[PDB]
Design a protein around this ligand. Sequence first.
Ligand SMILES: NCCCCCC(=O)O
Ligand SMILES: NCCCCCC(=O)O
Ligand code: NA
Ligand code: NA
Lengths: 384, 384
Amino acid sequence: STGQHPARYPGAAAGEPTLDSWQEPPHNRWAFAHLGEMVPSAAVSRRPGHALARLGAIAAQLPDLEQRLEQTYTDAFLVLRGTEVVAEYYRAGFAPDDRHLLMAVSKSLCGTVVGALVDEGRIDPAQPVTEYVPELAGSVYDGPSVLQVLDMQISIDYNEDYVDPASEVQTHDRSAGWRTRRHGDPADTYEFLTTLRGDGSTGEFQYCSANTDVLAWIVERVTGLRYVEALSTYLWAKLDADRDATITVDTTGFGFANGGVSCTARDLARVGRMMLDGGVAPGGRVVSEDWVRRVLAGGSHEAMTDKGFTNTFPDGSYTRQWWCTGNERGNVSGIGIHGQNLWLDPLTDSVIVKLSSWPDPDTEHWHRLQNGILLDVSRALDAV
Amino acid sequence: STGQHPARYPGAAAGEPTLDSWQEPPHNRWAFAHLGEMVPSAAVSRRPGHALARLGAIAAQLPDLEQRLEQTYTDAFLVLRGTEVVAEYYRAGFAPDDRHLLMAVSKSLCGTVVGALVDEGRIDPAQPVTEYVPELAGSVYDGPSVLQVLDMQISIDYNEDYVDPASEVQTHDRSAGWRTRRHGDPADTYEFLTTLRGDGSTGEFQYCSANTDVLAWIVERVTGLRYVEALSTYLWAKLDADRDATITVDTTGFGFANGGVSCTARDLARVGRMMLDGGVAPGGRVVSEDWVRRVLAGGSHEAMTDKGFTNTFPDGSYTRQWWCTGNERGNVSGIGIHGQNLWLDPLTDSVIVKLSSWPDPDTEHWHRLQNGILLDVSRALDAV
Ligand SMILES: NCCCCCC(=O)O
Ligand SMILES: NCCCCCC(=O)O
Ligand code: NA
Ligand code: NA
């Protein structure tokens, strides 16, 4: 029993519709207008072959930039300095307005939605997760605070080894529809989360994608809105974005908050712009000045024991779904496997978006190359 | 063995990627930019409750029109007289730019793509299906001509009883991903089509959705393009449409040509405009003047023995994926279950689009009400 969840549509029964009932009334009225949410679908282009490189000024400072982008399997790259796009790159086959999977950069967007609700006083990070999701009692989420979920400081028996077929990460994917279901798997993401356990210890950073989905669940319970709608209402609809974003959903219509969002590079940059603007977007304030300040300030350094991060960023940390480098530039970034970054460079009031498709999800090699590019581009923006 | 099929992406192996391999290289580069084709996904609106009724002039002639539209579960309704939108209606909850499933109206779009290839001489309707799809040898499609598929004049052991769980129509849905798979089901739509049989007779009309998917298969073999791309290249991209259309795809990426297309009402009207313009669209000629003339002329009346159609349209017929009323106005229409119509009224140079969600897929009751509305609106457009 996972309790009350936002109906797929007004008046919809729990879990309706399913792949086998969407053609039946009363579900069909909603389904006929949102079939992509039920069945895999392709776009039939309204528009009738080569990479687009417009690395503007930074090109002079970084002559081999395009080659470096190709070497890191770059699909879309965009640099926003202030309110101006000063550099752009799109691989052959990927249009400037095409959307790209954000993977874990999605987490930073979810944390933003949580921050908005904290500002409204609908969520108190000091409160235990169970204050909002009682059904998580008896699980590893029984005891920890919402802030500990936000900062990922909960010890959990969860193997985030993507390529490993036995890990909890694969089960998470199967429960959400990212992979084929196996007999006995949890029915949906909510159920999967309730199966998680840990030794009860907290305080130390442990990257776990389940944490973000718990945040999305909390968002749904406090607002009564499907996470998909909450993500739009509290964030996307206030960005004056060029295109809607998309998010994969499981069989109940629950969005894969931890990593299923897709959007254009230019629109993702609008999220960064909002962060550098103290939490304000064209459509209104998204989060408070305080929330943004706390994100830029970083999390507890002592909690950050991930050498995969500290080897490059010794004074790094993590807080509210954002990775904080703690470097001399105060860089903070949303990160997603296979090379996704929503990189903030407050010094130059710039945002760097890099959406890629490395063959591997996470290796020292790829991160070394990628971070080298992000840091070089950031420095190229400094006054000289 | 169903032979060669267009790769999901350049260089992709047969059937790749699958739900279990899209995160792996080299598939991920394509998948990260088209995840909706692999996993059900929802739109995250970039925009921040009541029906919109703008029945313009025809309102005076049809005072109870809005109520009649509500009674027929109308989601979107649009009347294009010449090049001008003279009447519009959208139910509460459905925006003017929202897309709606077309069901079998999709068939008329597929027939249009076939017509384009006939004009190019890449398809000869007189040729047997096996001339283009040899793998269909041994099936009910071994012997009939492409034109017989176009006109649906092939006797097939296929129960098109949607609500019936044992029918071939349900198996068709499961093979394409519209319903949950059962153990033993064909792997994809191509395989399903090869399992179809019949007594060998032809000449009499038999509405069968499998026919359209065979047409789409032929389209792929003659062009080398995924049907999804062919639908864009030969039709959608030439309409100067406001939005892309979408089409559900099966596990191989094959579009559900017989009924999985979704688009806005205004854009669907552009297809009708093209038909009334002799086959020409803003982006170029879609089909020949001759093809359009043949569609408007109708098919063999003797072949049309469907009382569900002839009771209302005694001189009606069917040809090239279009229903021809044979009425005094020469009305022709694309039709899809649950109330979808792309209705052509050549007399007034008008197109009527009605996208609905009747609780039932097909009953005399709903068709009586729906046709009454389409005919009344058509007559309201006559000069007086
Ligand atoms: N389990 C699917 C991948 C989720 C995203 C994880 C990440 O980007 O770190
Ligand atoms: N088997 C799914 C429905 C296909 C559309 C059929 C029709 O609209 O006539
Ligand atoms: Na806040
Ligand atoms: Na033609």
